[PDB]
Amino acid sequence: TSQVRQNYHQDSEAAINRQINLELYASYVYLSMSYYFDRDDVALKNFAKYFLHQSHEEREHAEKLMKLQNQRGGRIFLQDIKKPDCDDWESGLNAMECALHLEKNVNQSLLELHKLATDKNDPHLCDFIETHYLNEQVKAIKELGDHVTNLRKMGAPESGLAEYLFDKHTLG
Amino acid sequence: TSQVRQNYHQDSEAAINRQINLELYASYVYLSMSYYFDRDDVALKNFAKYFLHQSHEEREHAEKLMKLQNQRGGRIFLQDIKKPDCDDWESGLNAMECALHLEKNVNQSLLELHKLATDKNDPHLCDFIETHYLNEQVKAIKELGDHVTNLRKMGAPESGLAEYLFDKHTLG
Amino acid sequence: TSQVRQNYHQDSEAAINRQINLELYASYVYLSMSYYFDRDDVALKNFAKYFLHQSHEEREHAEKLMKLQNQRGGRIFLQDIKKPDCDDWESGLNAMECALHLEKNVNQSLLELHKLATDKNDPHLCDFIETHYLNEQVKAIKELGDHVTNLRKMGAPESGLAEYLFDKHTLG
Amino acid sequence: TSQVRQNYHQDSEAAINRQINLELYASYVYLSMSYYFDRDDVALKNFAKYFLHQSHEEREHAEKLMKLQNQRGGRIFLQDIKKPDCDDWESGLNAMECALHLEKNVNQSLLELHKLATDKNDPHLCDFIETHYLNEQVKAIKELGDHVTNLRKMGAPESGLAEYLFDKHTLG
Ligand SMILES: [Mg+2]
Ligand SMILES: [Mg+2]
Ligand SMILES: [Mg+2]
Ligand SMILES: [Mg+2]
Ligand SMILES: [Mg+2]
Ligand SMILES: [Mg+2]
Ligand SMILES: [Mg+2]
Ligand SMILES: [Mg+2]
Ligand SMILES: [Mg+2]
Ligand SMILES: [Mg+2]
Ligand SMILES: [Mg+2]
Ligand SMILES: [Mg+2]
Ligand SMILES: [Mg+2]
Ligand SMILES: [Mg+2]
Ligand SMILES: [Mg+2]
Ligand SMILES: [Mg+2]
Ligand SMILES: [Mg+2]
Ligand SMILES: [Mg+2]
Ligand SMILES: [Mg+2]
Ligand SMILES: [Mg+2]
Ligand SMILES: [Mg+2]
Ligand SMILES: [Mg+2]
Ligand SMILES: [Mg+2]
Ligand SMILES: [Mg+2]
Ligand SMILES: [Mg+2]
Ligand SMILES: [Mg+2]
Ligand SMILES: [Mg+2]
Ligand SMILES: [Mg+2]
Ligand SMILES: [Mg+2]
Ligand SMILES: [Mg+2]
Ligand SMILES: [Mg+2]
Ligand SMILES: [Mg+2]
Ligand SMILES: [Mg+2]
Ligand SMILES: [Mg+2]
Ligand SMILES: [Mg+2]
């Protein structure tokens, strides 16, 4: 057993490994979305920039969980990073909707993780999740909701003008 | 009687207390409007910022009247601040129209106050109202009129694109 | 249902609306206290400044809860802001004692809110309350306790000299 | 008749001359009060400084009225400046009370002047009085009221310690 390990349940260790994979998966989804908007037949550069930034943030989320695993004396176990569900994201609106769904899925996973940490009476892990993840998810979900709303109200996805102007004014 | 009181009619004192309540009410209306635009299903951040600023200005208006009451040796009497008439403000245009109506109501109250001050030959109070309130109301009403006009001309409330672009160009 | 809503119980939503009202009420109590000390027959300018600052802090507390409501996909429901229990706060000491009682009442409401959030397994809401409210209340209550103690030891409320000197040395 | 004179009643001209004398009288009262506190057997240097400043402000008030008289084409007529009612002002509290009475008398004179200007339909003169005099009087009266209140509450005039500490904390 690790010389540093204390009050860290094997179930929590495993759940942290699963969360690491999910964060890496989210990074990959956003990477794919970003370059879709870089296609010459899509060509929305600020959508591309926005999603690339989101991708990099998810890699940071994964790295912090890997750090946590080692801090607590658990052992990192990695698995394949699955390719994103879609190759062609259809429109700015559809990509935003997919991102919203993704962030809500990630949030649900984090809430399940917190429930486990609570069940195993691991207040350090609870605080870690609350501090570094839970409000970040709430903010991300709210932002994506706001974006989806604006795109719908502007007339997306049918209006190419709507996505163009949103790209300039909201994401620019 | 207050050692400072001079040429300050009891009716004027009471009218100032009523005006304090009205200013606080206006602050509350604008606070409510602001957060309506912060809803994920409305999501117009500059409408939200604009109305929050207006809310804070109304609190300043109330505070200055409370200061005046004490300056003249009257006694502040507070009453409940009524909740705003609406919970859901419907659209950017409708909120602007409500604000216009509010500011015109507040102006009418101030004009009645000035008429009272004039009837009681209180030139200090007349000057106070003129200096700090009457032109501020005229400017506010004109600005809201301008805003309503632009939103109508742009195609609001039906055009979600109109409110979106107004949010960026006029309120941004 | 709001597109952003996740793990947010209707009871929590309602409790947040009640807390918004309480924060606004506290803002109003402190506003009233502030201007009492601005009366020509009370004339303690640093008591007035101290309570006005406290009033503005409570408005910020209310605004943050309104932001939270929208972040989580709840809907803000406002109610009348009740006037403060008192018109004449009697003395610096009595005002401090009323503020202490107010902050303890607000704290109790926040603890009930946290208990609800805990019962509904809402760790995001728990963390929000802990981070932004619970220690602020503990600090406020401690400060007001300290103030009450000093005023009593100095000879307030009978000693007008005590309140005068406290105004200069502690609140100045 | 003066080439500049327009809408300026002879009664208003005379009333302005009377007001000039009153302002000069107030300057003299405050000068006397100031040096009372400079006596070796009184020795409150900040009371002395406060009243000397007030004296200089009254001279400025007189000068502005002399300027106004010429601006409107009236002719300045000066009269003796009467010595102050008292030689020995007794205490800091008593001097403050005398100043309060003085400023209220000056205010009454200004209100009578404004009533005359109103009766003669002289809006320029009304605005002059409102702008430069009426709120200055309200502020002065409020400040002196505040000072009297604090001195009374602290235990003046019996408490030499009260006047000493007020001299340091409020006037210092
Ligand atoms: Mg262990
Ligand atoms: Mg896995
Ligand atoms: Mg992100
Ligand atoms: Mg993440
Ligand atoms: Mg596969
Ligand atoms: Mg997908
Ligand atoms: Mg946090
Ligand atoms: Mg947010
Ligand atoms: Mg444009
Ligand atoms: Mg009166
Ligand atoms: Mg009322
Ligand atoms: Mg305004
Ligand atoms: Mg107002
Ligand atoms: Mg009602
Ligand atoms: Mg309305
Ligand atoms: Mg006038
Ligand atoms: Mg004027
Ligand atoms: Mg003006
Ligand atoms: Mg204008
Ligand atoms: Mg829910
Ligand atoms: Mg309520
Ligand atoms: Mg506070
Ligand atoms: Mg609070
Ligand atoms: Mg009631
Ligand atoms: Mg109370
Ligand atoms: Mg903390
Ligand atoms: Mg503390
Ligand atoms: Mg003439
Ligand atoms: Mg004369
Ligand atoms: Mg002066
Ligand atoms: Mg003068
Ligand atoms: Mg004589
Ligand atoms: Mg005298
Ligand atoms: Mg003025
Ligand atoms: Mg004042």
Mark yes or no for CB contact D153/C161 under 8 Å: yes
Please choose, from the candidates A16, A46, A50, A25, the residue with its C-alpha nearest in 3D space to the C-alpha of residue A120.
A16
What angle (nearest 5°) sits at the alpha carbon of residue D109, between those of residues D107 and D114? 95
Q: What gap in Å lies between CA C3 and CA B160, rounded to an integer?
A: 18
Q: What gap in Å lies between CA B147 and CA B47, rounded to an integer?
A: 11
Q: Give domain A1-172's CATH number out of 1.20.1260.10, 3.40.50.2000, 3.90.1530.10, 1.10.3720.10.
A: 1.20.1260.10
Would you call B87 an interface residue with chain C, using a CB distance cutoff of 8 Å?
yes
Tokens, residue D52: 């000397």
Query: What one-character-per-residue DSSP string does A115-130 give?
Result: HHHHHTT-HHHHHHHI
Mark yes or no for CB contact C121/A115 under 8 Å: yes
Tokens, residue B101: 């109506």
Please choose, from the candidates C65, C68, C79, C64, the residue with its C-alpha nearest in 3D space to the C-alpha of residue C5.
C68
CB-based burial of residue A150 (10 Å sphere; 0-12 exposed, 13-18 middle, 19+ buried)?
A: buried
C23 marked among binding-site residues:
yes
3-state secondary structure B114-169: HHHHHHCCCHHHHHHHHHHHHHHHHHHHHHHHHHHHHHHHHCCCCCHHHHHHHHHH
Q: Rounded to a whole number, what is the distance in Å from the CA of C164 to chain D's nearest CA?
A: 7
Q: What gap in Å lies between CA D149 and CA D159, rounded to an integer?
A: 14
Would you say the C-alpha torsion C118, C122, C124, C129 has a positive or negative sign? negative
Q: What gap in Å lies between CA C169 and CA C163, rounded to an integer?
A: 10
Report how far apart, in Å, the C-alpha atoms of B63 and of each of B43, B103, C31, D105 are: 31, 18, 8, 29
Please choose, from the candidates A71, A77, A99, the residue with its C-alpha nearest in 3D space to the C-alpha of residue A6.
A71
Please choose, from the candidates D61, D68, D54, the residue with its C-alpha nearest in 3D space to the C-alpha of residue D21.
D61
Would you call C142 an interface residue with chain B, using a CB distance cutoff of 8 Å?
no
Report resolution in angstroms.
1.5
3-state secondary structure chain C: CCCCCCCCCHHHHHHHHHHHHHHHHHHHHHHHHHHHCCCCCCCCHHHHHHHHHHHHHHHHHHHHHHHHHHHHCCCCCCCCECCCCCCCCCCHHHHHHHHHHHHHHHHHHHHHHHHHHHHCCCHHHHHHHHHHHHHHHHHHHHHHHHHHHHHHHHCCCCCHHHHHHHHHHCCC
Half-sphere exposure of B105 (CA within 13 A, CB side): 12
B58 marked among binding-site residues:
yes
Would you call B86 an interface residue with chain C, using a CB distance cutoff of 8 Å?
no
Residues 6+ apart with CB under 8 A from C164: C44, D150, D153, D154, D165, D166, D169
Q: Rounded to a whole number, what is the distance in Å from the CA of B163 to chain A's nearest CA?
A: 9
Would you call A138 an interface residue with chain C, using a CB distance cutoff of 8 Å?
yes
Decide: B and D in contact? Rule: 3+ Cβ pairs under 8 Å.
yes
Would you call C4 an interface residue with chain B, using a CB distance cutoff of 8 Å?
yes
Residues 6+ apart with CB under 8 A from A17: A69, A74, A76, A77, A78, A79
For residues A82 and A29, is the Cβ–Cβ distance under 8 A? no
Residues 6+ apart with CB under 8 A from C55: C27, C28, C29, C30, C31, C33, C34
Chains that touch A (3 or more CB pairs under 8 A): B, C
What angle (nearest 5°) sits at the alpha carbon of residue D92, between those of residues D90 and D97? 85
Please choose, from the candidates A143, A135, A153, A111, the residue with its C-alpha nearest in 3D space to the C-alpha of residue A19.
A111
Q: Rounded to a whole number, what is the distance in Å from the CA of A113 to chain B's nearest CA?
A: 26
Annotated binding site of D for Fe cation: 23, 58, 61, 103, 137
What residue has token string 């303690």?
Answer: C44
Distance in Å, CA B165 to ligand 20 centroid: 32
How long, in residues, is chain C?
172
Mark yes or no for CB contact C123/A131 under 8 Å: no
Every domain of chain C and the residues it spans: 1-172
Q: Rounded to a whole number, what is the distance in Å from the CA of C41 to chain D's nearest CA?
A: 6
